[PDB]
């Protein structure tokens, strides 16, 4: 069968992880994927797969993989699932209620938190509307909290979209940095490209 | 050999989401309009929702409207039910059953008879 | 690995003017949105302006009517001319690259003003 | 080459139905019969058509039709399938296995259930033998369980031929009233007097 | 040409009925039998007899009788049939596809269900292998749901086979106890020990 | 009608010890499997240990490493020694006899521990 390797090192061993409104979507195809390693990495804190069980990921072959890997507070991880609600589940990004794919994560307390605060992770509290399943909005217009227009100027009822997080090692378990990966699979009317584990 | 099998029920947390599919074997459910029904401990089978043979005329109970959704994969010969905003009241046994266009006027808003009775599945909500 | 080269800070007395500049030397997929932020010692990350390459301004009320931003589309560079400086507005400043894919962060420019 | 219609409304909108033992009948011919009208109307519980396809019905020409009407409870409707036995199928009505036609049924609770009970509808439990297919039995004789010669006198081993139905809204789904009309057809080489809507 | 009769009343009317994994078996022979009474007994609500119609069974001769009795939950009854699937069929008791004999069952809510729940009946939801026809191999080994050998110790991915049932009068009919007996006849070419009443 | 004679319960303070026993006085066809199940007021049946006459252990994690079981093959009795008791562990325990034909039960031994 086919033998190339899915660049997980560029994802899981990636030096830097993106913000929660500037997501990176990686496409993976034409390569062999070793999922049991991460399932036996004895590190992943979270393991929620939907549509395909965690163990039959490693015997099924897939047409395409699309990956989204970022850092979120541990308390807010509970809103990462299909059909769920909350600031991230609605304002940020929705998983479709029949989402086929996996949310897997591992806290990055010593990776993405600084003593003075790694404020590089920016999170919106308000939107004109919630997004669709797998909808990316990086629009930065100053939200109009009230009836008065903001004209791109903050002030009264005029708020910035997304505020920083004080990511520090001092944060509690819920507020600590967590490196979370959402993977969307496609078993569609196409040849499977992420294949190989038929051994 | 008319067999309706409900699957996807179980325990979910309030505020969550869930999905049922009951699969039809031995017959063409496509010609059949399907009603999903529910009885809890101590209550009778209520009319949760009803969908046409072709999927075009519909009914939801007032308690389930705006939170639950019926759909059907006629090609794959099954009927699906997506539940959103779960509440602890929803703990009950479910069935899907089949009948045809029940009146002058199309929709399945009215109750009818329910020929093919499935095994049913228990959907529990509690936290 | 988009790099944003920052320069144009330093020591200036009250009421003077400097000219910051940040340049995104990386991929910068499609249009981007290049922004400036402020961080004084002991505070959070404070936004100066998130003017996109096209539009949307995104000026703040803090130094309203004093700072301006010029966009150089030839080199995709964004220049921060700040005038009428005050010991309060002083902090270390970082430029920002929204890009299409992810956002990246500058290495810092110290801005100090006093009398 | 005829225009007059068959009395389907009169058949079904009829005020009164007969008991299971006595039932009703209609020799129906010389009329137009619209079944696309009926098949998608389902003011009915069961369309169970044997030897015939319900889509074909309006297409079909029939030499004659025979109609039967009687009300049943929900539990024991299943006994009406041919090749099956039940206290109805044994001691109320026998159905031939080579049955061409269609049974139609529907719950009639608001019509035929009353809180005080509708005991005018009778249900035969005892008979010396099961009836032959398509037979009625209006016998008024007291059934002898044992050797005691009742001679028309009830008592010990002297039984009521037809127990009265207790139809109330208190009845469960298996005990409620269900009016049932069986449409027996003969597929014979004869003038098809019951041709459906065709040109 | 025998004299002995079987204690059908003693065997059946006996209150003591086993569970499903440890169903109780009786080997009956040399006995003059009368199953017509048991047929009309009705008590055993269910009557599904395979290989013979129950009517002609009465006068028949039988080589040997195996009576296998237990109590079951209401919904699981359908899993008991020749060539039938289900968690009990594949994990507690499997009938041969060639099963000859009859399955009979009665409720018993008033006998086997207690408001506090009668958990004296265990069920093997978990097994290492499927059930062969007439297999009662009582194994309680802690199955290893994961790769770690549990060594008979519960914990992470270490579950138990036998789970009890909450038989209550408050239970639903599908979740209520049912007294079930299956009669199996090995009608091999061995002289019959149990027969019907005729010269 | 196999009888499972149970004795050895009662009231004991926290950290104390008792010794239960159940005896199968009936037929006991072939080898058996003698067990203990617990049921607290308001809860279902949970198996303490389903040790067999031969092997297979079957110890649970609830009181892992505190209770123990001894076989007496002369009389086919089984004794359950409990040590370092806690209020959570306390419930009513039934002896269990798998047998080869069908299962039987004990009649109860109350265990209560508190301080």
PDB file of C-alpha atoms in Angstrom, chain D residues 5-134:
ATOM      1  CA  UNK D   5     -68.838   6.337  -7.986  1.00  0.00           C
ATOM      2  CA  UNK D   6     -68.495   3.676  -5.314  1.00  0.00           C
ATOM      3  CA  UNK D   7     -69.883   4.525  -1.833  1.00  0.00           C
ATOM      4  CA  UNK D   8     -66.533   4.776  -0.055  1.00  0.00           C
ATOM      5  CA  UNK D   9     -67.652   7.573   2.251  1.00  0.00           C
ATOM      6  CA  UNK D  10     -70.830   5.692   3.122  1.00  0.00           C
ATOM      7  CA  UNK D  11     -68.667   2.618   3.707  1.00  0.00           C
ATOM      8  CA  UNK D  12     -66.370   4.536   6.043  1.00  0.00           C
ATOM      9  CA  UNK D  13     -68.294   7.563   7.290  1.00  0.00           C
ATOM     10  CA  UNK D  14     -71.002   5.109   8.389  1.00  0.00           C
ATOM     11  CA  UNK D  15     -72.339   5.908  11.851  1.00  0.00           C
ATOM     12  CA  UNK D  16     -72.662   2.351  13.164  1.00  0.00           C
ATOM     13  CA  UNK D  17     -70.410  -0.690  12.753  1.00  0.00           C
ATOM     14  CA  UNK D  18     -71.151  -4.319  13.515  1.00  0.00           C
ATOM     15  CA  UNK D  19     -69.632  -6.627  16.107  1.00  0.00           C
ATOM     16  CA  UNK D  20     -66.739  -8.938  15.280  1.00  0.00           C
ATOM     17  CA  UNK D  21     -68.844 -12.119  15.231  1.00  0.00           C
ATOM     18  CA  UNK D  22     -71.593 -10.733  12.982  1.00  0.00           C
ATOM     19  CA  UNK D  23     -69.665  -8.018  11.070  1.00  0.00           C
ATOM     20  CA  UNK D  24     -71.002  -6.471   7.851  1.00  0.00           C
ATOM     21  CA  UNK D  25     -70.665  -6.942   4.116  1.00  0.00           C
ATOM     22  CA  UNK D  26     -71.076  -5.121   0.824  1.00  0.00           C
ATOM     23  CA  UNK D  27     -71.261  -6.545  -2.681  1.00  0.00           C
ATOM     24  CA  UNK D  28     -69.857  -3.533  -4.548  1.00  0.00           C
ATOM     25  CA  UNK D  29     -69.873  -3.191  -8.341  1.00  0.00           C
ATOM     26  CA  UNK D  30     -71.015  -0.933 -11.191  1.00  0.00           C
ATOM     27  CA  UNK D  31     -69.193   2.083  -9.789  1.00  0.00           C
ATOM     28  CA  UNK D  32     -66.005   4.115 -10.009  1.00  0.00           C
ATOM     29  CA  UNK D  33     -63.407   3.454  -7.316  1.00  0.00           C
ATOM     30  CA  UNK D  34     -60.705   6.005  -6.502  1.00  0.00           C
ATOM     31  CA  UNK D  35     -57.848   4.529  -4.484  1.00  0.00           C
ATOM     32  CA  UNK D  36     -55.087   7.073  -4.922  1.00  0.00           C
ATOM     33  CA  UNK D  37     -57.723   9.095  -3.072  1.00  0.00           C
ATOM     34  CA  UNK D  38     -57.890   6.521  -0.280  1.00  0.00           C
ATOM     35  CA  UNK D  39     -54.304   5.277  -0.149  1.00  0.00           C
ATOM     36  CA  UNK D  40     -52.859   8.709   0.698  1.00  0.00           C
ATOM     37  CA  UNK D  41     -55.670   9.481   3.135  1.00  0.00           C
ATOM     38  CA  UNK D  42     -54.818   7.104   6.004  1.00  0.00           C
ATOM     39  CA  UNK D  43     -57.724   8.192   8.177  1.00  0.00           C
ATOM     40  CA  UNK D  44     -56.961   4.628   9.160  1.00  0.00           C
ATOM     41  CA  UNK D  45     -54.545   2.570  11.224  1.00  0.00           C
ATOM     42  CA  UNK D  46     -53.515  -0.319   8.959  1.00  0.00           C
ATOM     43  CA  UNK D  47     -53.348  -0.700   5.192  1.00  0.00           C
ATOM     44  CA  UNK D  48     -52.376  -4.381   5.027  1.00  0.00           C
ATOM     45  CA  UNK D  49     -52.896  -5.499   1.438  1.00  0.00           C
ATOM     46  CA  UNK D  50     -52.451  -9.165   0.515  1.00  0.00           C
ATOM     47  CA  UNK D  51     -52.115 -10.421  -3.041  1.00  0.00           C
ATOM     48  CA  UNK D  52     -52.126  -6.784  -4.185  1.00  0.00           C
ATOM     49  CA  UNK D  53     -49.838  -3.746  -4.208  1.00  0.00           C
ATOM     50  CA  UNK D  54     -51.358  -0.577  -2.707  1.00  0.00           C
ATOM     51  CA  UNK D  55     -49.854   1.636  -5.412  1.00  0.00           C
ATOM     52  CA  UNK D  56     -51.511  -0.546  -8.054  1.00  0.00           C
ATOM     53  CA  UNK D  57     -54.967  -0.121  -6.502  1.00  0.00           C
ATOM     54  CA  UNK D  58     -56.277   2.847  -8.498  1.00  0.00           C
ATOM     55  CA  UNK D  59     -54.753   1.092 -11.518  1.00  0.00           C
ATOM     56  CA  UNK D  60     -56.709  -2.088 -10.790  1.00  0.00           C
ATOM     57  CA  UNK D  61     -59.964  -3.256 -12.364  1.00  0.00           C
ATOM     58  CA  UNK D  62     -62.043  -5.530 -10.145  1.00  0.00           C
ATOM     59  CA  UNK D  63     -64.950  -7.796 -11.014  1.00  0.00           C
ATOM     60  CA  UNK D  64     -66.597  -7.250  -7.614  1.00  0.00           C
ATOM     61  CA  UNK D  65     -65.741  -6.144  -4.084  1.00  0.00           C
ATOM     62  CA  UNK D  66     -66.896  -7.388  -0.702  1.00  0.00           C
ATOM     63  CA  UNK D  67     -66.738  -5.200   2.383  1.00  0.00           C
ATOM     64  CA  UNK D  68     -66.642  -6.198   6.060  1.00  0.00           C
ATOM     65  CA  UNK D  69     -66.941  -3.898   9.092  1.00  0.00           C
ATOM     66  CA  UNK D  70     -66.326  -4.574  12.799  1.00  0.00           C
ATOM     67  CA  UNK D  71     -64.532  -3.001  15.778  1.00  0.00           C
ATOM     68  CA  UNK D  72     -61.632  -4.542  17.720  1.00  0.00           C
ATOM     69  CA  UNK D  73     -59.154  -3.741  20.474  1.00  0.00           C
ATOM     70  CA  UNK D  74     -55.526  -2.919  19.769  1.00  0.00           C
ATOM     71  CA  UNK D  75     -53.878  -6.038  21.205  1.00  0.00           C
ATOM     72  CA  UNK D  76     -55.518  -8.660  19.019  1.00  0.00           C
ATOM     73  CA  UNK D  77     -55.486  -6.980  15.584  1.00  0.00           C
ATOM     74  CA  UNK D  78     -52.357  -8.977  14.684  1.00  0.00           C
ATOM     75  CA  UNK D  79     -54.441 -12.181  14.765  1.00  0.00           C
ATOM     76  CA  UNK D  80     -56.097 -11.102  11.503  1.00  0.00           C
ATOM     77  CA  UNK D  81     -53.070 -12.037   9.489  1.00  0.00           C
ATOM     78  CA  UNK D  82     -53.706 -15.213   7.463  1.00  0.00           C
ATOM     79  CA  UNK D  83     -51.756 -18.235   8.572  1.00  0.00           C
ATOM     80  CA  UNK D  84     -52.088 -17.030  12.169  1.00  0.00           C
ATOM     81  CA  UNK D  85     -54.333 -18.179  15.004  1.00  0.00           C
ATOM     82  CA  UNK D  86     -56.126 -16.224  17.717  1.00  0.00           C
ATOM     83  CA  UNK D  87     -59.367 -16.301  19.644  1.00  0.00           C
ATOM     84  CA  UNK D  88     -60.733 -14.108  16.870  1.00  0.00           C
ATOM     85  CA  UNK D  89     -58.959 -16.071  14.147  1.00  0.00           C
ATOM     86  CA  UNK D  90     -60.295 -19.202  15.850  1.00  0.00           C
ATOM     87  CA  UNK D  91     -63.732 -18.283  17.191  1.00  0.00           C
ATOM     88  CA  UNK D  92     -64.758 -14.968  15.597  1.00  0.00           C
ATOM     89  CA  UNK D  93     -63.579 -14.927  11.966  1.00  0.00           C
ATOM     90  CA  UNK D  94     -61.338 -17.119   9.810  1.00  0.00           C
ATOM     91  CA  UNK D  95     -59.240 -15.603   7.027  1.00  0.00           C
ATOM     92  CA  UNK D  96     -58.142 -17.670   4.008  1.00  0.00           C
ATOM     93  CA  UNK D  97     -54.406 -17.655   3.391  1.00  0.00           C
ATOM     94  CA  UNK D  98     -54.910 -17.128  -0.356  1.00  0.00           C
ATOM     95  CA  UNK D  99     -56.517 -13.796   0.428  1.00  0.00           C
ATOM     96  CA  UNK D 100     -56.546 -11.151  -2.292  1.00  0.00           C
ATOM     97  CA  UNK D 101     -57.675  -7.823  -0.934  1.00  0.00           C
ATOM     98  CA  UNK D 102     -56.688  -5.461   1.846  1.00  0.00           C
ATOM     99  CA  UNK D 103     -57.566  -5.093   5.504  1.00  0.00           C
ATOM    100  CA  UNK D 104     -57.931  -1.503   6.694  1.00  0.00           C
ATOM    101  CA  UNK D 105     -58.167  -0.524  10.349  1.00  0.00           C
ATOM    102  CA  UNK D 106     -58.268   2.605  12.517  1.00  0.00           C
ATOM    103  CA  UNK D 107     -58.642   3.453  16.190  1.00  0.00           C
ATOM    104  CA  UNK D 108     -62.065   4.970  16.898  1.00  0.00           C
ATOM    105  CA  UNK D 109     -61.956   5.992  20.553  1.00  0.00           C
ATOM    106  CA  UNK D 110     -63.700   9.372  20.593  1.00  0.00           C
ATOM    107  CA  UNK D 111     -66.400   7.666  18.486  1.00  0.00           C
ATOM    108  CA  UNK D 112     -66.717   4.183  19.979  1.00  0.00           C
ATOM    109  CA  UNK D 113     -65.266   4.519  23.492  1.00  0.00           C
ATOM    110  CA  UNK D 114     -67.470   5.940  26.239  1.00  0.00           C
ATOM    111  CA  UNK D 115     -66.468   6.299  29.882  1.00  0.00           C
ATOM    112  CA  UNK D 116     -69.387   4.142  30.987  1.00  0.00           C
ATOM    113  CA  UNK D 117     -68.360   1.464  28.492  1.00  0.00           C
ATOM    114  CA  UNK D 118     -69.727   0.285  25.145  1.00  0.00           C
ATOM    115  CA  UNK D 119     -70.955  -3.249  25.835  1.00  0.00           C
ATOM    116  CA  UNK D 120     -73.114  -3.496  22.706  1.00  0.00           C
ATOM    117  CA  UNK D 121     -70.090  -4.984  20.919  1.00  0.00           C
ATOM    118  CA  UNK D 122     -69.701  -8.708  21.357  1.00  0.00           C
ATOM    119  CA  UNK D 123     -66.686 -11.027  21.390  1.00  0.00           C
ATOM    120  CA  UNK D 124     -67.015 -14.792  20.941  1.00  0.00           C
ATOM    121  CA  UNK D 125     -64.796 -16.969  23.126  1.00  0.00           C
ATOM    122  CA  UNK D 126     -66.353 -20.425  22.810  1.00  0.00           C
ATOM    123  CA  UNK D 127     -67.127 -22.581  19.780  1.00  0.00           C
ATOM    124  CA  UNK D 128     -66.923 -26.318  19.212  1.00  0.00           C
ATOM    125  CA  UNK D 129     -64.587 -25.693  16.270  1.00  0.00           C
ATOM    126  CA  UNK D 130     -62.916 -22.848  14.431  1.00  0.00           C
ATOM    127  CA  UNK D 131     -64.896 -21.374  11.562  1.00  0.00           C
ATOM    128  CA  UNK D 132     -63.954 -21.825   7.938  1.00  0.00           C
ATOM    129  CA  UNK D 133     -62.609 -18.715   6.167  1.00  0.00           C
ATOM    130  CA  UNK D 134     -65.082 -15.853   5.700  1.00  0.00           C
TER     131      UNK D 134
END
